[PDB]
């Protein structure tokens, strides 16, 4: 079984979902077309359980991470600083908005994807949320701007080889930037 | 000739996506030959080049056109996000490039293409900054990085926002504009 995700993980991660064929993923993994079935009886079956546990992965590591940053100016700040390091989530982003757009009629497999939209931005919610509760800013839309946030970011991570430092560097800005912005 | 190839190619990647359409498929709705494909443009990945670079070219006129009704670079700053949403939201292409970025972002040889093609789109919001920095309306240090950001940030709420409601994709973009000015101050 972890024999078959991990491969597929890295294969969606390097040539997206397309690409990445069932036997290709059975080749490299040395099990049958067979044995992937029973176990995640379709691809898009095997694509929905690597994402759940990716940000279940993500959610853990930012659990313990946020604990570092006092006030949440601070955790927005290394938030967006550790979706550039991590090793989860945002290297599938690819692949995930070449998933999403082709089962997006399919609302099995849309309402998982929202379901695991929804828990990326929360991240985003508290933050402000709590930024509101202790005086560090003044936001009237929660939703709204943790939607923008988390996307923005997300376009900065996905779309920015390339300088691991001058990445960080490029984030703190706009992250300087974003949170002037509300005040 | 080559018009042709091109030409079936952008309705065959526009109609089956980038993946599910094939080089022989191409060949034969042109009436060509696959020698002729490869001498032309010698991968489907560098064929897609060619198309997006034609694209490219249409909408910097298009651009050419629409920002001469803002009259400060501050109404150009919106007007360029919120027109980026809209026009990507029922550009036919967009599926086929997605399915080819998400293929290709990895990729020495195409990466680098692809790279100075993005930079384009980029360089609009270089403009806007520097002539802002000029007109009084700003200033900002680093040019080259802020315009970065702000591309690849508009980029990302105009591929990522799974929200349906055009009309609320609309609101989130301007009030994102907003804050981003209004931080730069
Ligand atoms: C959809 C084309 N495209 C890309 C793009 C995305 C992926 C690969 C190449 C270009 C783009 C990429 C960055 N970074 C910033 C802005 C744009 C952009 C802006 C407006 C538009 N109308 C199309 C745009």
Do not use: C
């Not at 996307?151 to 992250?175: C, D, H, P, W, Y």
């Amino acid at each position: 079984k972890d024999k078959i995700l991990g491969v597929a993980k890295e294969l969606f991660i390097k040539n997206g979902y397309n690409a990445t064929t069932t036997g290709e993923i059975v080749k490299l993994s040395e099990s049958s077309k067979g044995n992937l079935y029973y176990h995640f009886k379709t691809k898009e079956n095997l694509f929905l359980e690597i994402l759940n546990i990716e940000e279940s992965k993500w959610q853990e590591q930012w659990k313990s991470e946020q604990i570092k940053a006092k006030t949440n100016r601070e955790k927005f700040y290394l938030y967006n600083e550790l979706s550039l390091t991590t090793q989860y989530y945002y290297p599938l982003q690819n692949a995930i908005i070449e998933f999403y757009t082709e089962y997006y009629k399919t609302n099995s497999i849309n309402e998982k994807m929202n379901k695991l939209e929804n828990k990326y931005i929360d991240a985003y919610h508290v933050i402000f949320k709590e930024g509101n509760l202790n005086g560090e800013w003044s936001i009237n839309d929660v939703n709204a701007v943790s939607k923008i946030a988390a996307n923005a970011v997300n376009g900065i991570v996905t779309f920015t080889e390339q300088n691991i430092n001058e990445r960080i560097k490029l984030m703190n800005k706009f992250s300087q930037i974003f949170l002037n912005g509300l005040s």
